[PDB]
UniProtKB/Swiss-Prot annotation, chain B:
Bilayer topology term: Single-pass membrane protein
Pfam family, one: PSI_PsaJ
Name the record gives this protein: Photosystem I reaction center subunit IX
TM ranges: 7-27
InterPro entries: PSI_PsaJ, PSI_PsaJ_sf
GO cellular component annotations of the record: chloroplast thylakoid membrane; photosystem I
GO biological process terms on file: photosynthesis
The organism of origin for this protein: Spinacia oleracea
UniProtKB/Swiss-Prot annotation, chain D:
Cofactor info, note text: P700 is a chlorophyll a/chlorophyll a' dimer, A0 is one or more chlorophyll a, A1 is one or both phylloquinones and FX is a shared 4Fe-4S iron-sulfur center.
TM spans (from-to): 58-81, 144-167, 183-207, 279-297, 326-349, 365-391, 413-435, 511-529, 569-590, 644-666, 704-725
Any one GO cellular component localisation term in the record: chloroplast thylakoid membrane
Pfam family, one: PsaA_PsaB
Catalytic activity: reduced [plastocyanin] + hnu + oxidized [2Fe-2S]-[ferredoxin] = oxidized [plastocyanin] + reduced [2Fe-2S]-[ferredoxin]
Residues given in the record as chlorophyll a' binding sites: H655
Lineage: Eukaryota, Viridiplantae, Streptophyta, Embryophyta, Tracheophyta
Protein name: Photosystem I P700 chlorophyll a apoprotein A1
Example of a GO MF term: chlorophyll binding
Gene name linked to the record: psaA
Organism (species): Pisum sativum
């Protein structure tokens, strides 16, 4: 007769969303951008074709020393000051709560009209395409599936096999 | 969504998602080192 | 990976390929890219000569569709004088 | 309770201490209520004082069994499929020795995975799929992989009928509280329309696809996935397309036939699983009945009828409250369902119904003891729940002066007899053996009770066995052999790997086990009978229906005043039955191998797994560990480093778990309290205990952790003892 | 809010009345007899065969019955009502042009009033008789005695 589940943090799920998905922008346009036959060709000789490898797992370290830094700073002062103890304001804390952060300390604040209001108008823009980005990337992340599964010849694994017409992979279109 | 001074609950036997698993990841150390009876160190 | 010349000299190629006569399928039943056959006409059983025969002929086969309907003889039961034997 | 309603929350009850009797789980903390909650979780003296729902729950929380038996089976069909051995075993039976399960070689594991047949590593089976599975008028591994998901289909759906009850706003009274038709339906067309339906898919398809399997081939060199439609042309080899008959009746001519069936009895030479040419006829000849039968009726009438002098005035009116009980119409059932399971346990071993059983020894005795513990574990229950009636179910006393009010009238009486019955037995039913020891260890055989010393003379024969394998000469039509090959008269030639069934002779050492059974079956029942009868009132306590059918014990007075009750009569009644079945098992295999199971070769000089050691040597009750326990079991205590090994390696635990029960069985209670505090003290010093008042076991919970252990202990012990003396020689 | 599904003695019958109504023209074979010269059979045994057939093949069979089933439940929502369906076009006063209205039958309304001379000389019967057209091909798929045939005859 209907679930018991608006996770109160029904309020927070929605912000790894704008994380996950704005983000899939980075893959969506640079991919098919690629640049078909640019003129053309992909060749990267430079730091890479003679100094004994370049990356892989010095890759990650440097690579996400920064993502390191930044992803942390991201949610852990999104906002929330007050930042300790001890009775309920719910999210699972707002034990920042009624105090934002400081009683007349510094400029904790951005912007006049005693709040943080990045003004009133802009529902426009990112309500639409952006929680789009959530939606969008559902189905061209449902293409990740289509785009490659079938492990282009070079391997049948656990041999059912189980019929046979013709191949599959990616580049755009479809026989049909 | 969870800050400082204890958090949200959980069921009767989440121990069955604690015996199974965690502990489960340990067979996962008992095949990486498929064997013991003393041990080298790091 | 690591590239020397040029992702190719001559680009990707004959792996889909069909071109002059993209044929197979649309064609094959290139017996019958035109299931053309016989007479024009007419007398009898046609299906010449390859194809064959007429096997039981008139309204039968032909269906297929032989054609037509005829003052018959309209199949229905009893006859064919079940000419067996 | 709110939270708060009635009517005027959807907001569900997750949070606020308790529920279940009203100075409930109290604010104040404790542990006992955590075995409470699970125990008596299903019950009905609480939930509501009003029938209504309960039947609306049990028709749902039921459901989730079928669905389950349904998630189960699937992982068995799947399992009996891609974790193959079935494909390999079937082209190659007599030869293989089946598997479905296999480990994964983590840690010590692998020893458990030891070459089983069609060329692979695994752990064996004593659960006769691979043999229902003979059926497959088709064969194929991925196919069972459809029958498998076909299983998960029935489930999710035959599990959303359980949403589509209680949680959905439910039916009510009339629906079940008009019973008028129920069996009408059930037996007619399912009991009927299955057996019937089963007929149609038991000659159509199966018969033919093992009519020409009992020879050779390799499957798909036989039985396509559709092949068996309109094509009534291969049905040509296994009788006419009726030729000139039209819907049975008689203006029919046989100058040479009589449809499929053509009744058998005996055993296929090449697959002695009993003939299938019959198996259709018998299921057909069932259904009809059910088809005709489930057509009674609408109910009192028939029972509101035949009375007499001493008979049952209340026979007439034998329960309005049999539309208003459950605990009653469950207890009745369990006696039947239960007592109608272990009747399987015989007609199986003395009349196999699947291809390749008997030759398969271990893959149908496992059976005959699994089916055997249910036709027992469901019977003591079938008493428990009557005690649950006898105590409470109805509202008041509206039930009066009848068959029962009668039986109770005598009660220090029906159980007055039955008692002496047992000590007459026991003396004639066990010390009988003890004679032998005391006098064979004294040693003078002249005077034992041997199949040969006390007067009986080289024959048993003349009774009824010998007028069963010989009866195809009565009103009997016939059909070579009998009905069950194990009967006195005629025939031998049964099977070309190992053996199957043959006469099975008797006299003494068959005479007196058969009698220990009596005394065992009888004193079991004494304690349940007197237990459920004296359910509510007595001359040790009359104020004795005042809580429930459990209650620990009334109190130190009256002398004892402890066991009484009837939870506990259904506690010491299990304690026996564990024997009742545990010694019936001990019987069958020592017979079935001492004689029967054994083996042919030239001149078919029979060579039993044991040249009848039974003879003069079960009669001694030491011979029962000379010839049994110490003889066989040498395979359990040799079993280390092997493939089955998991049995010997259980056989120590569970031969431990039992010897842990006694601790739970044999002990006080304020004891582990008195102890639990010394503990609780040391706890408080470091500051580590109080919250949720740790408490000892609930007098009768303690008994609950006896018994249950004493059984899962004392039982699996043999479950191991067995599978370890039929796998490998036998 | 959560979607609805009212059971009540006999929805199952209004939508069950309807199911067969659709299947009464999905009866197809003899309602539109030009439909199958031989198309009732999806594709004999002998049968007929003197595949099943030449063909109109293919794949893209699920996508249809799904995607246009992604319409059956729209003339089931849209006309819950609050009307604005004719979004017209921002500018342009020249769009009096209508088409119909809500249609059931000869259209917008019935129309062109003016009628009767000759054609000449409820409505569960417009249902009842076409299951007496549906379930009829039902056995006619397997409509054979084969070994023998018409005893009758
Ligand atoms: C997704 C759904 C769902 C939800 C949210 C609920 C919620 C509820 N149900 Mg419920 N129910 C459901 C599906 C659901 N049900 C289904 C599918 C069935 C039929 C199969 C039922 C049959 C049912 C009955 C008869 C009752 C309820 C009741 C209730 C209420 C008490 C629930 C409770 O705490 O039980 C806790 C129990 C569970 C969460 C597990 C359910 C047990 C089954 C279905 C699966 C477990 C078996 C499993 C194999 C365990 C044994 C093996 C083990 C070794 C792992 C609550 C509102 C009760 C009520 O109205 O209040 C008195 C009432 O007794 N339900
Ligand atoms: C068709 C019947 C079936 C049904 C539907 C019921 C239903 C019921 N019985 Mg019941 N019963 C049955 C057969 C049945 N019984 C049989 C055959 C017996 C004889 C053994 C009994 C003996 C019995 C007793 C003594 C009692 C009931 C009670 C009840 C009621 C309480 C149910 C409960 O809370 O779960 C109880 C289940 C548990 C708490 C789960 C614990 C199970 C443990 C012991 C595990 C078993 C060992 C197993 C090997 C361990 C799993 C593997 C492990 C090693 C990993 C309920 C109405 C009780 C009552 O008070 O009536 C209102 C009462 O206690 N029954
Ligand atoms: C179930 C067992 C039982 C039975 C039936 C027997 C029977 C026997 N034992 Mg024995 N024995 C037993 C247990 C039993 N024992 C045990 C447990 C031990 C060890 C404790 C022994 C140790 C033992 C020894 C050492 C010896 C025996 C011997 C004997 C034999 C002589 C008996 C005798 O002379 O009594 C005299 C008989 C009577 C007075 C007969 C009357 C009693 C009957 C009729 C009661 C019947 C009730 C009545 C018919 C009810 C009908 C109602 C009426 C109105 C019609 C006899 C065959 C002796 C022997 O050598 O045997 C070969 C030997 O002495 N036993
Ligand atoms: C705690 C006590 C102490 C200990 C250590 C034991 C130990 C034992 N007693 Mg014992 N006993 C004791 C006190 C003790 N007793 C007392 C005070 C008495 C009363 C005087 C008894 C009366 C008694 C009797 C009558 C018996 C025993 C027996 C036994 C033995 C069983 C064989 C065995 O376990 O092989 C050891 C090997 C294993 C346990 C291998 C286990 C591998 C398996 C189980 C799998 C691994 C474990 C896994 C968790 C299980 C799967 C469960 C899963 C679902 C979670 C065991 C050695 C029995 C016996 O065998 O001979 C006398 C006999 O029944 N005892
Ligand atoms: C450099 C950093 C590293 C670190 C420290 C973090 C840290 C964080 N990431 Mg993150 N992330 C990383 C690499 C990292 N990420 C990478 C390499 C990717 C993929 C390219 C992501 C993709 C990602 C997504 C989609 C999200 C996060 C989110 C988060 C936040 C919650 C993470 C979480 O799952 O809770 C840990 C809790 C557990 C129970 C485990 C947290 C600040 C989420 C967020 O921002 O929430 C507001 C969500 O948006 N990350
Ligand atoms: C074969 C067994 C089996 C089945 C079919 C059931 C079925 C049921 N049990 Mg149950 N139970 C069992 C074994 C079983 N139990 C055992 C072994 C125990 C241990 C004592 C319990 C202890 C227990 C309790 C305390 C309760 C139930 C309850 C229930 C009912 C609640 C269904 C629900 O609320 O949502 C179904 C929910 C899901 C399917 C969610 C998924 C959860 C996992 C486990 C899967 C349902 C009738 C509840 C009740 O009173 O109803 C009668 C009650 O809360 N059971
Ligand atoms: C009646 C049975 C029940 C039981 C006791 C088992 C037991 C087992 N299954 Mg299983 N299974 C079941 C139902 C069951 N299954 C059903 C209904 C399905 C269909 C969804 C499956 C599909 C399945 C698969 C695909 C696998 C198992 C495997 C296994 C084994 C791996 C152990 C594990 O599950 O956790 C760990 C174990 C012997 C695994 C196996 O056989 O490999 C050794 C394999 O992973 N099962
Ligand atoms: C209830 C059962 C079960 C089911 C679902 C079927 C179903 C079928 N049987 Mg059948 N059959 C069954 C049990 C069953 N049989 C049994 C037990 C026998 C032996 C006593 C037969 C002997 C049999 C024969 C000889 C034939 C069939 C044929 C058929 C098919 C069409 C004719 C028909 O019987 O019904 C539908 C009724 C009409 C068409 C009128 C149909 C698939 C026939 C066939 O192959 O297809 C035409 C024909 O060959 N059956
Ligand atoms: C010591 C042990 C164990 C033992 C154990 C033993 C020593 C024994 C046991 C046993 C068990 C059992 C036993 C269970 C079960 C079961 C089953 C499953 C059964 C089944 C069956 C059936 C079906 C019915 C009847 C028959 C049979 C039984 C077969 C352990 C210990 C430990 C430690 C150190 C610490 C931590 C934890 C652990 C790790 C845990
Ligand atoms: C086990 C203790 C003996 C007490 C019972 C003995 C009485 C009956 C005699 C033997 C019983 C076993 O029966 C067995 O007889 C013969 C053994 O010689 C075998 O004889 C079989 O072998 C030969 C091969 O053609 C032929 O002699 C027979 O036609 C054939 O039946 C059979 O496999 C079986 O029918
Ligand atoms: C030994 C014995 C006890 C003592 C037995 C006890 C206290 C068993 C209860 C022990 C529980 C099961 C330990 C539970 C602790 C853990 C579940 C908590 C940690 C959670 C896990 C992760 C370990 C009784 O209470 C008793 C009562 C009546 C008759 C006989 C006896 C009897 O024989």
């Amino acid at each position: 007769s209907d679930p018991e589940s608006l996770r109160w943090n029904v309020q927070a799920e929605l912000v790894h969303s704008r994380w996950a998905m704005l983000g899939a922008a980075g893959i969506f346009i640079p991919e098919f951008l690629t640049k078909l036959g640019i003129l053309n060709t992909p060749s990267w000789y430079t730091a890479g074709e003679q100094e004994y490898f370049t990356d892989t797992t010095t890759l990650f370290i440097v690579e996400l020393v920064f993502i390191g830094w930044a992803e942390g700073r991201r949610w852990a002062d999104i906002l929330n000051p007050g930042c300790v103890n001890t009775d309920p304001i719910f999210p699972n804390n707002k034990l920042t709560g009624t105090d934002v952060g400081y009683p007349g300390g510094l400029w904790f604040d951005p912007l006049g009209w005693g709040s943080a209001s990045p003004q009133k108008l802009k529902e426009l823009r990112t309500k639409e395409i952006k929680n789009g980005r959530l939606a969008m990337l559902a189905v061209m992340g449902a293409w990740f599936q289509h785009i490659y599964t079938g492990t282009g010849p070079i391997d049948n694994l656990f041999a059912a096999h189980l019929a046979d017409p013709h191949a599959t992979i990616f580049a755009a279109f479809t026989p049909k | 969504m969870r800050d400082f001074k204890t958090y949200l609950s959980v069921a009767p036997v989440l121990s069955t998602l604690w015996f199974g698993s965690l502990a489960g990841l340990l067979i996962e150390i008992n095949r990486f080192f498929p064997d013991a009876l003393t041990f080298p160190f790091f | 990976g690591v590239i020397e010349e040029y992702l190719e000299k001559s680009k990707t190629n004959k792996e889909l390929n069909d071109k002059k006569r993209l044929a197979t399928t649309g064609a094959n039943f290139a017996r019958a890219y035109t299931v053309e056959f016989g007479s024009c006409k007419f007398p009898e059983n046609f299906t010449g000569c390859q194809d064959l025969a007429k096997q039981k002929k008139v309204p039968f086969l032909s269906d297929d569709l032989d054609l037509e309907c005829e003052g018959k003889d309209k199949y229905k039961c009893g006859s064919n004088v079940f000419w067996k034997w | 309770l709110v939270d708060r309603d009635p009517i005027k929350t959807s907001f569900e009850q997750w949070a606020k201490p308790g529920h279940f009797s009203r100075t409930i789980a109290k604010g104040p903390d404790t542990t006992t209520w955590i075995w409470n909650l699970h125990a008596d979780a299903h019950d009905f003296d609480s939930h509501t004082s009003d029938l209504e729902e309960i039947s609306r729950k049990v028709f749902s929380a039921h459901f989730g069994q079928l669905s389950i038996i349904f998630l189960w089976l699937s992982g068995m069909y799947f399992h009996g499929a891609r974790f193959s051995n079935y494909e390999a075993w079937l082209n190659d039976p007599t030869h293989i020795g089946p598997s479905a399960q296999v480990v994964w070689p983590i840690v010590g594991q692998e020893i458990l995975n030891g070459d089983v047949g069609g060329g692979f590593r695994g752990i064996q089976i004593t659960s006769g799929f691979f043999q229902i599975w003979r059926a497959s008028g088709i064969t194929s591994e991925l196919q069972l992989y459809c029958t498998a998901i076909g299983a998960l289909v029935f489930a999710g759906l035959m599990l959303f009928a359980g949403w589509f009850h209680y949680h959905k706003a439910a039916p009510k009274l009339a629906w079940f509280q008009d019973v008028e038709s129920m069996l009408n339906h059930h037996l007619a067309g399912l009991l009927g329309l299955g057996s019937l339906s089963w007929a149609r898919h038991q000659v159509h398809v199966s018969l033919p696809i093992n009519q020409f399997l009992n020879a050779g081939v390799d499957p798909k060199e036989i039985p396509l996935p559709h092949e068996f439609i309109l094509n009534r042309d291969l049905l040509a080899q296994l009788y006419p397309s009726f030729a000139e008959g039209a819907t049975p009746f008689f203006t029919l001519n046989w100058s040479k036939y009589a449809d499929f069936l053509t009744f058998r009895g005996g055993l296929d030479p090449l697959t002695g699983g009993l003939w299938l040419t019959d198996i259709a006829h018998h299921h057909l000849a069932i259904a009809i009945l059910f088809l005709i039968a489930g057509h009674m009726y609408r109910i009192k009438d028939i029972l509101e009828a035949h009375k007499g002098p001493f008979t049952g005035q209340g026979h007439k009116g034998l329960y309005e409250i049999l539309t208003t009980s459950w605990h009653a119409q469950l207890s009745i059932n369990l006696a039947m369902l239960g007592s109608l399971t272990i009747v399987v346990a015989q007609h199986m071993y003395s009349m196999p119904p699947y291809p390749y059983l008997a030759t398969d020894y271990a893959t149908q005795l496992s059976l005959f003891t699994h089916h055997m513990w249910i036709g027992g574990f469901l019977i003591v229950g079938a008493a428990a729940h009557a005690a649950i009636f006898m105590v409470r179910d109805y509202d008041p006393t509206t039930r009066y002066n009848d068959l029962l009010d009668r039986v109770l009238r005598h009660r220090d009486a029906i159980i007055s007899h039955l008692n002496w019955v047992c000590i007459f037995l026991g003396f004639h039913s066990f010390g009988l053996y003890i004679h032998n020891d005391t006098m064979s260890a004294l040693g003078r055989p002249q005077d034992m009770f041997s199949d040969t010393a006390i007067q009986l003379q080289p024959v048993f024969a003349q009774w009824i066995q010998n007028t069963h394998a010989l009866a195809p000469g009565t009103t009997a039509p016939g059909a070579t052999a009998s009905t069950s090959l194990t009967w006195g008269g005629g025939d031998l030639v049964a099977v070309g790997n190992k053996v199957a069934l043959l006469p099975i002779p008797l006299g003494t050492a068959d005479f007196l086990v058969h009698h220990i059974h009596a005394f065992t079956i009888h004193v079991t029942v004494l304690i349940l009978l007197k237990g459920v009868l004296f359910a509510r009132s007595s001359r040790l306590i009359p104020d004795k229906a005042n809580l429930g059918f459990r209650f620990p014990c009334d109190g130190p007075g009256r002398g004892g005043t402890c066991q009484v009750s009837a939870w506990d009569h259904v506690f010491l009644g299990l304690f026996w039955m564990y024997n009742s079945i545990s010694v019936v098992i001990f019987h069958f295999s020592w017979k079935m191998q001492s004689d029967v199971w054994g083996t042919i070769n030239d001149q078919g000089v029979v060579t039993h797994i044991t040249a009848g050691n039974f003879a003069q040597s079960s009669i001694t009750i030491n011979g029962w560990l000379r010839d049994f326990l110490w003889a066989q079991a040498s395979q359990v205590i040799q079993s280390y480093g092997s493939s089955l090994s998991a049995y010997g390696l259980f056989f120590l635990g569970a031969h431990f778990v039992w010897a842990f029960s006694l601790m739970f069985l044999f002990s006080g209670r304020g004891y582990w309290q008195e102890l639990i505090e010394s503990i609780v003290w040391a706890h408080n010093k470091l500051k580590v205990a109080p919250a949720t008042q740790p408490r000892a076991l609930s007098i009768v919970q303690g008994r609950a952790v006896g018994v249950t252990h004493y059984l899962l202990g004392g039982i699996a012990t043999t479950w191991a003892f067995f599978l370890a003396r039929i796998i490998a020689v036998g | 809010s959560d979607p609805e599904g009212t059971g009540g003695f006999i929805e199952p019958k209004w939508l069950a009345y309807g199911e067969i109504i659709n299947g009464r023209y999905a009866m197809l074979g003899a309602v539109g007899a030009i439909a199958p010269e031989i198309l009732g059979k999806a594709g004999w045994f002998r049968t007929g065969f003197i595949y099943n057939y030449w063909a109109d093949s293919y794949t893209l069979f699920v996508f249809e019955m799904a995607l246009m089933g992604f319409a059956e439940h729209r003339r089931f929502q849209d006309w819950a009502k609050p009307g604005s369906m004719g979004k017209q076009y921002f500018l342009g006063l020249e769009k009096g042009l209508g088409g119909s209205g809500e249609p059931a039958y000869p259209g917008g309304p019935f129309f062109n009033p003016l009628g009767f001379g000759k054609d000449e000389k409820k409505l569960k019967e417009v249902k009842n008789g076409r299951l007496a057209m549906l379930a009829i091909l039902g056995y006619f798929v397997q409509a054979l005695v084969t070994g023998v045939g018409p005893y009758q005859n």
